[PDB]
Amino acid sequence: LEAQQQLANSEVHGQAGGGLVKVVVKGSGEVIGVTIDPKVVDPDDIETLQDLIVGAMRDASQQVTKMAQER
Amino acid sequence: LEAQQQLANSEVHGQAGGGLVKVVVKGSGEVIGVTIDPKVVDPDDIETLQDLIVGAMRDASQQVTKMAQER
């Protein structure tokens, strides 16, 4: 199960807002991509955008943990 | 040095672009804040914004590692 530890190299997908912000993160924690929907790229509401990015990171982290709870 | 392991609760600051995107992350990896400068909230260049967020996450991760290399 040092074999299981090398799910550090799994890519996990997180999202907030139903895909308004999507992120790709390695099991290691390394963030490899961020994809932002044009709807939330609005300079009159940066706050919402920021919250969705944090939310999508949280989603991914909780995914990593769910896939890790597999041995 | 299980005492040192509880630098999991340190807050570390990362940035890209000279502050265009700033992030706050716990030593644990948990992202707690993201702050985006209005200049890069431009729907004609989402790509740049995305790259800065990844860049700021990378910065923070490298900070966590630098502070961890302290015992």
Side-chain angles (χ1 to χ4, degrees), chain A residues 1 3 7-8 11-38 40-65 67-68, chain B residues 1 3 7-8 11-38 40-65 67-68:
Chain A
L1 67 55
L7 101 190
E11 276 176 11
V12 182
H13 289 234
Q15 69 78 23
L20 290 164
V21 179
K22 293 180 297 182
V23 303
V24 183
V25 305
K26 280 187 159 289
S28 83
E30 175 194 2
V31 167
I32 72 190
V34 174
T35 301
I36 294 163
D37 187 279
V40 292
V41 184
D42 169 14
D44 293 337
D45 194 356
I46 300 172
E47 185 60 21
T48 283
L49 174 58
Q50 297 173 351
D51 287 343
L52 290 167
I53 294 156
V54 171
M57 295 295 191
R58 178 175 356 104
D59 185 54
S61 140
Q62 58 216 356
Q63 292 320 321
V64 167
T65 293
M67 93 155 30
Chain B
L1 67 55
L7 101 190
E11 276 176 11
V12 182
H13 289 234
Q15 69 78 23
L20 290 164
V21 179
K22 293 180 297 182
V23 303
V24 183
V25 305
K26 280 187 159 289
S28 83
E30 175 194 2
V31 167
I32 72 190
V34 174
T35 301
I36 294 163
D37 187 279
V40 292
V41 184
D42 169 14
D44 293 337
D45 194 356
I46 300 172
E47 185 60 21
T48 283
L49 174 58
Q50 297 173 351
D51 287 343
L52 290 167
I53 294 156
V54 171
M57 295 295 191
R58 178 175 356 104
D59 185 54
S61 140
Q62 58 216 356
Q63 292 320 321
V64 167
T65 293
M67 93 155 30

PDB file of all heavy atoms in Angstrom, chain A residues 12-16 21-25 56-57 59-60 63:
ATOM      1  N   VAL A  12      -7.796  14.639  -9.942  1.00  0.00           N
ATOM      2  CA  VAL A  12      -9.103  14.686  -9.386  1.00  0.00           C
ATOM      3  C   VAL A  12      -9.782  16.021  -9.868  1.00  0.00           C
ATOM      4  O   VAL A  12      -9.094  17.051  -9.992  1.00  0.00           O
ATOM      5  CB  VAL A  12      -8.928  14.648  -7.855  1.00  0.00           C
ATOM      6  CG1 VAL A  12     -10.236  14.644  -7.173  1.00  0.00           C
ATOM      7  CG2 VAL A  12      -8.169  13.384  -7.438  1.00  0.00           C
ATOM      8  N   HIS A  13     -11.069  15.966 -10.170  1.00  0.00           N
ATOM      9  CA  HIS A  13     -11.840  17.106 -10.699  1.00  0.00           C
ATOM     10  C   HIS A  13     -12.761  17.703  -9.646  1.00  0.00           C
ATOM     11  O   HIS A  13     -13.609  17.011  -9.096  1.00  0.00           O
ATOM     12  CB  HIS A  13     -12.593  16.635 -11.921  1.00  0.00           C
ATOM     13  CG  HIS A  13     -11.685  16.380 -13.105  1.00  0.00           C
ATOM     14  ND1 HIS A  13     -11.867  16.941 -14.353  1.00  0.00           N
ATOM     15  CD2 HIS A  13     -10.605  15.571 -13.231  1.00  0.00           C
ATOM     16  CE1 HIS A  13     -10.928  16.522 -15.176  1.00  0.00           C
ATOM     17  NE2 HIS A  13     -10.125  15.722 -14.507  1.00  0.00           N
ATOM     18  N   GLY A  14     -12.628  18.969  -9.344  1.00  0.00           N
ATOM     19  CA  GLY A  14     -13.576  19.634  -8.483  1.00  0.00           C
ATOM     20  C   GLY A  14     -14.349  20.746  -9.184  1.00  0.00           C
ATOM     21  O   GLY A  14     -13.871  21.296 -10.208  1.00  0.00           O
ATOM     22  N   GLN A  15     -15.508  21.073  -8.654  1.00  0.00           N
ATOM     23  CA  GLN A  15     -16.302  22.140  -9.214  1.00  0.00           C
ATOM     24  C   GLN A  15     -17.095  22.855  -8.189  1.00  0.00           C
ATOM     25  O   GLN A  15     -17.414  22.270  -7.093  1.00  0.00           O
ATOM     26  CB  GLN A  15     -17.209  21.619 -10.376  1.00  0.00           C
ATOM     27  CG  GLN A  15     -18.335  20.704  -9.921  1.00  0.00           C
ATOM     28  CD  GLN A  15     -19.489  21.417  -9.328  1.00  0.00           C
ATOM     29  OE1 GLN A  15     -19.725  22.609  -9.569  1.00  0.00           O
ATOM     30  NE2 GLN A  15     -20.323  20.668  -8.625  1.00  0.00           N
ATOM     31  N   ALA A  16     -17.355  24.113  -8.469  1.00  0.00           N
ATOM     32  CA  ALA A  16     -18.399  24.861  -7.731  1.00  0.00           C
ATOM     33  C   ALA A  16     -19.370  25.516  -8.631  1.00  0.00           C
ATOM     34  O   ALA A  16     -19.112  25.939  -9.795  1.00  0.00           O
ATOM     35  CB  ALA A  16     -17.802  25.870  -6.746  1.00  0.00           C
ATOM     36  N   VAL A  21     -16.909  27.175 -11.867  1.00  0.00           N
ATOM     37  CA  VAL A  21     -15.452  27.060 -11.685  1.00  0.00           C
ATOM     38  C   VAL A  21     -15.185  25.615 -11.566  1.00  0.00           C
ATOM     39  O   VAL A  21     -15.909  24.874 -10.806  1.00  0.00           O
ATOM     40  CB  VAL A  21     -14.873  27.881 -10.489  1.00  0.00           C
ATOM     41  CG1 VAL A  21     -13.390  27.625 -10.457  1.00  0.00           C
ATOM     42  CG2 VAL A  21     -15.188  29.388 -10.653  1.00  0.00           C
ATOM     43  N   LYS A  22     -14.229  25.123 -12.344  1.00  0.00           N
ATOM     44  CA  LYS A  22     -13.810  23.754 -12.311  1.00  0.00           C
ATOM     45  C   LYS A  22     -12.308  23.787 -12.056  1.00  0.00           C
ATOM     46  O   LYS A  22     -11.522  24.692 -12.496  1.00  0.00           O
ATOM     47  CB  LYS A  22     -14.104  23.066 -13.680  1.00  0.00           C
ATOM     48  CG  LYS A  22     -15.585  22.923 -13.956  1.00  0.00           C
ATOM     49  CD  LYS A  22     -16.007  22.266 -15.279  1.00  0.00           C
ATOM     50  CE  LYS A  22     -15.605  22.983 -16.472  1.00  0.00           C
ATOM     51  NZ  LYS A  22     -16.149  22.214 -17.639  1.00  0.00           N
ATOM     52  N   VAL A  23     -11.846  22.811 -11.280  1.00  0.00           N
ATOM     53  CA  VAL A  23     -10.421  22.686 -11.031  1.00  0.00           C
ATOM     54  C   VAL A  23      -9.987  21.202 -11.201  1.00  0.00           C
ATOM     55  O   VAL A  23     -10.835  20.259 -11.075  1.00  0.00           O
ATOM     56  CB  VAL A  23      -9.963  23.210  -9.665  1.00  0.00           C
ATOM     57  CG1 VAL A  23     -10.321  24.636  -9.419  1.00  0.00           C
ATOM     58  CG2 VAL A  23     -10.499  22.359  -8.542  1.00  0.00           C
ATOM     59  N   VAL A  24      -8.746  21.084 -11.582  1.00  0.00           N
ATOM     60  CA  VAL A  24      -8.023  19.792 -11.657  1.00  0.00           C
ATOM     61  C   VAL A  24      -6.814  19.817 -10.719  1.00  0.00           C
ATOM     62  O   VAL A  24      -5.916  20.657 -10.821  1.00  0.00           O
ATOM     63  CB  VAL A  24      -7.678  19.420 -13.079  1.00  0.00           C
ATOM     64  CG1 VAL A  24      -7.007  18.022 -13.046  1.00  0.00           C
ATOM     65  CG2 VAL A  24      -8.920  19.295 -13.896  1.00  0.00           C
ATOM     66  N   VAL A  25      -6.770  18.835  -9.797  1.00  0.00           N
ATOM     67  CA  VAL A  25      -5.777  18.789  -8.768  1.00  0.00           C
ATOM     68  C   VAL A  25      -5.235  17.353  -8.715  1.00  0.00           C
ATOM     69  O   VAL A  25      -5.993  16.388  -8.962  1.00  0.00           O
ATOM     70  CB  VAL A  25      -6.313  19.230  -7.405  1.00  0.00           C
ATOM     71  CG1 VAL A  25      -6.938  20.639  -7.501  1.00  0.00           C
ATOM     72  CG2 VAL A  25      -7.244  18.145  -6.879  1.00  0.00           C
ATOM     73  N   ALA A  56     -14.592  25.319  -5.394  1.00  0.00           N
ATOM     74  CA  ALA A  56     -14.114  24.285  -6.287  1.00  0.00           C
ATOM     75  C   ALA A  56     -12.874  23.601  -5.736  1.00  0.00           C
ATOM     76  O   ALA A  56     -12.724  22.309  -5.873  1.00  0.00           O
ATOM     77  CB  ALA A  56     -13.881  24.901  -7.697  1.00  0.00           C
ATOM     78  N   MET A  57     -11.975  24.351  -5.089  1.00  0.00           N
ATOM     79  CA  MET A  57     -10.811  23.747  -4.402  1.00  0.00           C
ATOM     80  C   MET A  57     -11.238  22.846  -3.260  1.00  0.00           C
ATOM     81  O   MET A  57     -10.742  21.698  -3.124  1.00  0.00           O
ATOM     82  CB  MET A  57      -9.810  24.825  -3.949  1.00  0.00           C
ATOM     83  CG  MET A  57      -9.157  25.560  -5.110  1.00  0.00           C
ATOM     84  SD  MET A  57      -8.102  24.525  -6.137  1.00  0.00           S
ATOM     85  CE  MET A  57      -7.386  25.872  -7.057  1.00  0.00           C
ATOM     86  N   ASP A  59     -14.188  21.253  -3.037  1.00  0.00           N
ATOM     87  CA  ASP A  59     -14.740  20.116  -3.713  1.00  0.00           C
ATOM     88  C   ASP A  59     -13.681  19.110  -4.112  1.00  0.00           C
ATOM     89  O   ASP A  59     -13.815  17.852  -3.875  1.00  0.00           O
ATOM     90  CB  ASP A  59     -15.701  20.576  -4.848  1.00  0.00           C
ATOM     91  CG  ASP A  59     -16.418  19.394  -5.513  1.00  0.00           C
ATOM     92  OD1 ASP A  59     -17.046  18.631  -4.737  1.00  0.00           O
ATOM     93  OD2 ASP A  59     -16.222  19.136  -6.722  1.00  0.00           O
ATOM     94  N   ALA A  60     -12.595  19.585  -4.693  1.00  0.00           N
ATOM     95  CA  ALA A  60     -11.547  18.711  -5.146  1.00  0.00           C
ATOM     96  C   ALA A  60     -10.923  18.046  -3.960  1.00  0.00           C
ATOM     97  O   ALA A  60     -10.640  16.843  -4.012  1.00  0.00           O
ATOM     98  CB  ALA A  60     -10.495  19.462  -5.904  1.00  0.00           C
ATOM     99  N   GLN A  63     -13.005  15.322  -2.772  1.00  0.00           N
ATOM    100  CA  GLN A  63     -12.863  14.204  -3.717  1.00  0.00           C
ATOM    101  C   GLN A  63     -11.601  13.370  -3.454  1.00  0.00           C
ATOM    102  O   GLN A  63     -11.646  12.134  -3.487  1.00  0.00           O
ATOM    103  CB  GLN A  63     -12.870  14.653  -5.208  1.00  0.00           C
ATOM    104  CG  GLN A  63     -14.142  15.220  -5.847  1.00  0.00           C
ATOM    105  CD  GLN A  63     -15.404  14.513  -5.451  1.00  0.00           C
ATOM    106  OE1 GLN A  63     -15.429  13.285  -5.332  1.00  0.00           O
ATOM    107  NE2 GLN A  63     -16.492  15.285  -5.274  1.00  0.00           N
TER     108      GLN A  63
END
